[PDB]
Amino acid sequence: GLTYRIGNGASVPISNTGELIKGLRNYGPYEVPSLKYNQIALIHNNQFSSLINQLKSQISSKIDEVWHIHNINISEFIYDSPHFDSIKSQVDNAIDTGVDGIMLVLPEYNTPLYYKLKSYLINSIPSQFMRYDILSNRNLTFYVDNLLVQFVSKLGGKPWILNVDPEKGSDIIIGTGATRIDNVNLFCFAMVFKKDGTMLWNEISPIVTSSEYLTYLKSTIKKVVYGFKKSNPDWDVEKLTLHVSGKRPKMKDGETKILKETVEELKKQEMVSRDVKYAILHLNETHPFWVMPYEGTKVKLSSKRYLLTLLQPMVTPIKPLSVEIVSDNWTSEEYYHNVHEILDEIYYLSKMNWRGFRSRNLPVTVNYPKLVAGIIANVNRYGGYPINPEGNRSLQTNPWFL
Amino acid sequence: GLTYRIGNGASVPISNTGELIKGLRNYGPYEVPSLKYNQIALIHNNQFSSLINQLKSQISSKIDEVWHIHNINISEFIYDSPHFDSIKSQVDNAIDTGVDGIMLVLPEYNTPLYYKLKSYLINSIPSQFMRYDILSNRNLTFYVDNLLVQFVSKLGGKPWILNVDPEKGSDIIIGTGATRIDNVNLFCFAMVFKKDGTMLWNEISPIVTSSEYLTYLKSTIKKVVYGFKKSNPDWDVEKLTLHVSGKRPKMKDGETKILKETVEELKKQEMVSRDVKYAILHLNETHPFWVMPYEGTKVKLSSKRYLLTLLQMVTPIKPLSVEIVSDNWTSEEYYHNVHEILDEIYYLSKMNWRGFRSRNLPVTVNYPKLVAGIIANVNRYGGYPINPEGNRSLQTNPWFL
DNA sequence: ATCGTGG
DNA sequence: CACGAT
DNA sequence: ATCGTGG
DNA sequence: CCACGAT
Ligand SMILES: C[As](C)(=O)[O-]
Ligand SMILES: C[As](C)(=O)[O-]
Ligand SMILES: C[As](C)(=O)[O-]
Ligand SMILES: [K+]
Ligand SMILES: [Mg+2]
Ligand SMILES: [Mg+2]
C-alpha cells in the first residue's frame, strides 16, 4: 500500500498517526529545517500560567525528540495589553534579537486582531499562532503534536513525502485557478508541486475584479513556472498536469483556451519541454454521500469525466472529487494509460497534508490554494498587511499558509 | 446469497445460467403450465426446409426435457406470402384446430407487419415470433433456449421465482405510473407483484393526453387492486409499496397527492388493511458509469434519496435512483423499512422471464417498459387495440415478453 | 487562530 | 458550538 | 421480432 | 443500424 517516506530512508504506512509519530521519533522527518539562529520566540500574555509553562515544555521536548531539531533555545516575550500595538512591539523585539520563527499566543478568537497580526508576521518571519483560551491539559499532547507539523513546515522542514513510482505520473503538477473573495473581486493562484506532494513554488496575483481574471490567470501561471525553472534549471518537464480549482468566473471555454496558450508560450520559452505531454483538469468537490472498498476507487462517467471516491478522514461517508479532462495532447493509444496515472496521482496527493498528522483526503493542489484564499480574503476584509509573494523567496518556497 | 426456486422444492444460485439450465433439466421449472390442447402451432413460409426442421426438433426436445412439458405436439401451417392477410389466414386456421400457443416465423424485419400481427395474436392466444433471416446466422442452441423461457411464461408457466424471506418485504408491490408514446400522448399502467417477483395482475389505461394523466392514474390503480383482490380474496395487504416510474408529466407534487389519496380510498373499501403500512417510491434509471463487487450495494444520497448500483478492465454499473416520496412509517421503524424496501428492489431486479440472462432492472420498472413498447408501436402502425380489462389471460399473464 | 467533523 | 484525535 | 451490449 | 456473445 501507499507509504510516507520520512528520515534516514524509512517509510511508514499511511492512515496511521501513531506509527507516523513513532517513525519520526525513531528516524526523524524527511528533511530537518536548516535554521539560522537556533532560536525561536514564544510571545504571550500570561507570564505565570501553568498551561503556558506546560506548552513551552512540550514544544521544547517534541521539537528535539520528534522533529530532531536539536539544541534550539526558546526565548520568551510578554506583552501587557492584549492589543495590536503592544503585541507588535514584542514581535519586533523578538525579531530584533535574531530568531528563526515566532510562536504567538493570543488571548482568544478575535478575528480582526488575528488577521492584522498574522498578515504582519507572514510578511516578516515564519510564525505559528495559538489561542490561550483554548489550551487544556486534556488536549495539550494532540495540540502540540499537530501544531509542530505545520510550524516545522513553515520553517522550511519537510515532515514526510509520498513514496511514489518515479516512472509514473507528472514531472510537475500546477494547482491553479482563482478564488472569489466576494461577488466582484478575486485573486488568481498558481502552485507548483512535485509528484511526491512537495510544494516547489507559489505565486498569487493581486486582488483584481472578475473582468481581469483571464489576464491575471496567465501571468500568475507564467510567473510561478519562471520561478520554479529559475531555481530548478535542470528539472525537465516532459509530463505536466494542471489541476484547476476554486470558485471563479464561469468562463470555461475561454479559460481553457487561455490555459492552452499559456502552456504553448511556456513551451516556446523552453520553460517546459517542447514536446511536453500535458492535460488540463478541473477538480471539483461534489456532494457527499454514504455507502450503506472505496479507498482509491475510480469511477468513469464518460471519456472525459471521472469521480474519485475519497473517504472522509451504519454508513461510510464518501467525499467524492470530480475530475474533468478539459484538454490534453495525448495520443488515443496512450489515453487510458495516462488517465489511470493522473487519477492515481490525484489520490496520492490527497494523502499529503502538512497542516497536522491526519490526512485531509483532499488533493494538496486544491487544499493549499483554499488555505491561501482564507488568508487573502480575510486580510482584505479586516485591513491587514497585503501579502506580496513575488520577490520574497521565503514566501514563494515555503508553505506560509498552513 | 440469493437463489431461484425452481421445481420440486429445488433452488439454484442466481447469476449462473449453466446451473439454472441444468437445474431445470433435473427438477423442472417452478410451475409447469397446464395446457388445454397439448398442441403448439408453428406457422412459417419455408415448408420442407431443414433450418425449420432442426428448430422444431430443438423446440420439441427442450420443452420436454428442460421445461418438463410432456407429450406436446407441434403442428405446421404454411402461408403462401409474407403479407398480413395470408398469415392471418393460417393463424386463424391454427386457432380453429385448437392450439395452446402459436410460434410465428416471419421472413424479415417488417415493423408494421410485425405489430399488426402481434397485436392480433395478443388479443387471441399466447404467441412467440421469430425471424427466419437472423435464424440462419445465430447459434440455434442459445436461440431456442432463451426463446422458450418467454414462450413458456406466455403460456402461464413460472420458470423460477425468487427465494425470499416471507417475514420481510411488501405483501404486494404495485409498479405504476405512465409512459409517453410521443410529446403529447401517454398511457398509465399498474401491475401487482408478489415479493418473489411474480406478476399477479396488470391493467393499462387507454392512450390519453398528458392533461388526463392524474385522473387515469388513479383509475388504472384502483382497477388493478380491485382485479387482484377479486382473484385473491384472502390476501392480507398489511404492507404495501408503490414503485412509480416511466417518462411521464412533471407533476410530482400532484401525482404524490393523487397516489396518497388512492391508497386512502382503497383502505376505506377494505382492499388493503385498515392499518396498512405503505410507502410510495419513485424509481428512475440514472446515467450509467464504470468502476475502473458492488453487487447489492446501496448508496444514501439524502434521507429520502438512495442509489442502487445494479451491475449491468471496468465494471459497468446501471444505477437505479430510489426516492421515498411518501410513507406511513414511524420514525422508530424507518431505517429498518428503508433497508427492507431497498433489498426488495435489488431482489426484483433478478426477476426476468425474457430469457436466462437477468436484466438487472426491477420487474416493476422493466415490464411496464416492455408493455409501453408494444402499446406505442401498435398505435403508430395501426394494429389491434390492446386492453386487458375484459380478458383474464391478459390480466394475469406476461403477454408483453 | 493545533486540526477536523457533525450539530 | 460541541467533541475526538495518537 | 431469443435478447443484450458496445462501437 | 450492423455485429458478435451467451450455457
Ligand atoms: C481514446 As478517446 C475515448 O479520448 O478518443
Ligand atoms: C495593516 As495596513 C496599515 O498595511 O493596511
Ligand atoms: C384494428 As386494425 C389492425 O384491423 O386497423
Ligand atoms: K406475447
Ligand atoms: Mg495554521
Ligand atoms: Mg419477446
Coordinates of C-alpha atoms (C1' of nucleotides) in Angstrom, one line a residue, chain A residues 111 114 129 131 143 312, chain C residues 1-6:
Chain A
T111 CA -10.7 37.8 14.2
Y114 CA -5.7 37.8 14.4
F129 CA -0.3 31.4 16.3
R131 CA -5.2 30.7 21.5
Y143 CA -2.5 20.2 20.3
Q312 CA -14.0 11.1 4.8
Chain C
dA1 C1' -6.2 31.2 15.2
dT2 C1' -3.4 22.6 16.6
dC3 C1' -6.9 20.5 13.4
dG4 C1' -11.2 18.4 11.8
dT5 C1' -16.2 16.7 11.8
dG6 C1' -21.3 16.6 12.9

